[PDB]
Amino acid sequence: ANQLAKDLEIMFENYVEGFEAACVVSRNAKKFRPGDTAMQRAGDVLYRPQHY
């Protein structure tokens, strides 16, 4: 047989199709931003009261 050279044909940006996360539960949760100075002074914990 001829013993021809064999190359690698790699299509470096033709990614095959890939998975995802929908993030739907965390899209729907309530979102809060305490202020990072206050959290630093508090030691990264805060407290909210409950009704009597």
Place this chain on the structure above:
Amino acid sequence: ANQLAKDLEIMFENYVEGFEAACVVSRNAKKFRPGDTAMQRAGDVLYRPQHY
């Protein structure tokens, strides 16, 4: 007139109805044509990346 000659009436390209394949799945798939010189140099294989 008891002994008349009998022919064959053959309608040589008047075909009766015939079966088919519908080719539905291969009509619906993606088609790709990678280039014959490139595939020959590559040994009839090519590669596509997957995401990190």
